[PDB]
Design a protein around this ligand. Structure first.
Ligand SMILES: [Mn+2]
Ligand SMILES: [Mn+2]
Lengths: 340, 345
């Protein structure tokens, strides 16, 4: 163990669940978010599933203010959209950099992971307690034990969609999982991931009491592809969606399109333009698009190391978010008309 | 919660398996020797080539022992020129599903007896190193290295997990050199990024020798290096891909390793000796950035499906070159190493 500096004690998932209990509203909300998201990706419901909110959460109170606005918009638009807030705790870096709330909640390289996990669960409880479902990237394979009861959607990021460990993980999660296409912009690895996660897996994993055991999973048939561009180009357009559909196996779930990341070409101000392009497909009868993902915050833009502004990727601001989501809802309505 | 968890089965702790299947003094010295030689070669202290050679995966301990005996004998002959580490790969990343290796399902019949897999794996690693033959394996699982690390001289992160922050974190705490493969699309940037990330100290949740989760702090691993293994945009073992790979290395970079198989073989194990010819030509001509090579090699060539009913010493995963071809390839590689010395004086 020449490269292990040490091991510091860790509260067990079960312990944290008792110390920071979910409310009845919190649990009911998480269940509802899962039902609603399942109905949309499997084509039972004709609304669009929207995963919308910050790139990352670094500020609990700001996240709560944002949740309150989004919960109100979600009440306004619920005939047409099912909204789940991005409450992303874990951030994959290109090389190194802030990994998120769990890993370093004080954002100052002290890495108080126990406090991160307490802040993470108190956050998840606080958001779901106002009746808003939340979603997060499942990067760490141990973290979900601490938080899964509160979560209605999980994302596997572009850099881990190929990882057999993350496909294993997804195969045992109690909620829908969106696998992002690879960083090269092609979808094959995400389709492979969905198939893989749909099978039963055996692997070593951590229990609620914090010990390693052999886990057997059931297989997760609520996995879907998220289109998020990449080096081969953006993939939110009708030609990219036609190629995507051409590649889907029998049994596939609906596609989600991420407006941000590679689909925004390094410019958050592109997300409303992606929205216009996606809305046009939907409004003209595209039924394979069942989800969108949007990086949105109280205030727009980003910053390196200001209230309600991202410290990771740049987001559209609140007012733009309203306009984007109202436009999406209307495209949903128009699609109902086409389908009559 | 746990609606897609069918159950948890008990697992022996790493410490417990370490006591039940102890490493011999020879095993431990061999693992340490293998790390020293590999460090010396990737950091440019020694002018031999590091060779990671052997089966795609191990599914048969006795065939693995016979392969190891022939390999050790060859390694004694060519040790002036080549530092050889056996591939004893226990964990196999699949395109979708399929046999994941000896740990996951050692009986190869979907019974998934992971306790027996871990015992077979560790017994295997002790058997190989106990003849003085150092071993390597892909570090796919972030928990299994606790069972096995005291015996390992080289760790690989597969193309499919080079971008994964968990695997960069893992590598940053392993006591041996780690090779990151370029991505499946054939580009190198993600491997260079993985090496830089693994060289840093990380804090993450991990499993201890006693089998409980705790927060791990690593030191960072300065012995990570890039393995060129081709991919969708084409093969990358030739002199121009090598020059373009050297152009992207940051200051402080370790030497490059070229994988003859996988993406650099174009769907055909018969191409491994042809990649050898091209690689040898660069080495013999003075290329000092190429410090390692990787070869998928078994007692017999080709591969076979799973029909108990398996033919002896044939791969049940990727196709390999057979033993005879291997001896030829390595002899020729040794020759190129000697020629390089002549060019460098
Ligand atoms: Mn982002
Ligand atoms: Mn292979």
């Amino acid at each position: 163990d020449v490269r292990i500096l040490g091991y510091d004690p860790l509260a067990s998932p079960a312990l944290l669940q008792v110390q920071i209990p979910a409310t009845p509203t919190s649990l009911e909300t998480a269940k509802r978010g899962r039902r609603e998201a399942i109905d949309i990706i499997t084509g039972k419901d004709d609304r669009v599933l929207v995963i919308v909110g910050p790139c990352s959460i670094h500020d609990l109170e700001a996240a709560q203010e944002y949740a309150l606005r989004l919960k109100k918009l979600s009440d306004e638009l619920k005939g047409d959209l099912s909204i789940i807030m991005r409450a992303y705790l874990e951030k994959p870096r290109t090389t190194v950099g802030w990994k998120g709330l769990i890993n370093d909640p004080d954002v100052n390289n002290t890495f108080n992971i126990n406090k991160g996990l307490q802040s993470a669960r108190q956050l998840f409880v606080n958001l779901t307690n106002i009746g808003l479902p939340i979603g997060s990237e499942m990067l760490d394979t141990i973290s979900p034990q601490y938080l899964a009861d509160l979560v209605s959607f999980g994302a596997i990021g572009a850099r881990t969609t190929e990882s057999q460990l993350h496909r294993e993980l997804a195969s045992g999660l109690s909620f829908p999982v969106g696998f992002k296409n690879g960083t090269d912009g092609t979808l094959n690895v995400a389709v492979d991931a969905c198939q893989a996660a749909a099978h039963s897996h055996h692997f070593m994993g951590v229990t609620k009491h914090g010990v390693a055991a052999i886990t057997t999973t059931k297989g997760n048939e609520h996995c879907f592809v998220i289109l998020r561009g990449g080096k081969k180009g953006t993939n939110y357009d009708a030609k990219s969606v036609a190629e995507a559909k051409a590649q889907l196996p029998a049994g596939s779930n609906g596609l989600m399109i991420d407006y941000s990341h590679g689909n925004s070409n390094k410019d958050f101000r592109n997300q409303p333009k992606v929205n216009d392009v996606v809305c046009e497909q939907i409004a003209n009868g595209e039924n394979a698009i069942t989800g969108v993902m949007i990086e949105s915050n109280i205030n727009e833009g980003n910053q390196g190391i200001k209230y309600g502004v991202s410290i990771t990727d740049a987001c559209i601001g609140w007012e733009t978010t309203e306009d984007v989501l109202r436009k999406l809802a209307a495209a949903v309505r128009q699609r109902r008309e086409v389908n009559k």
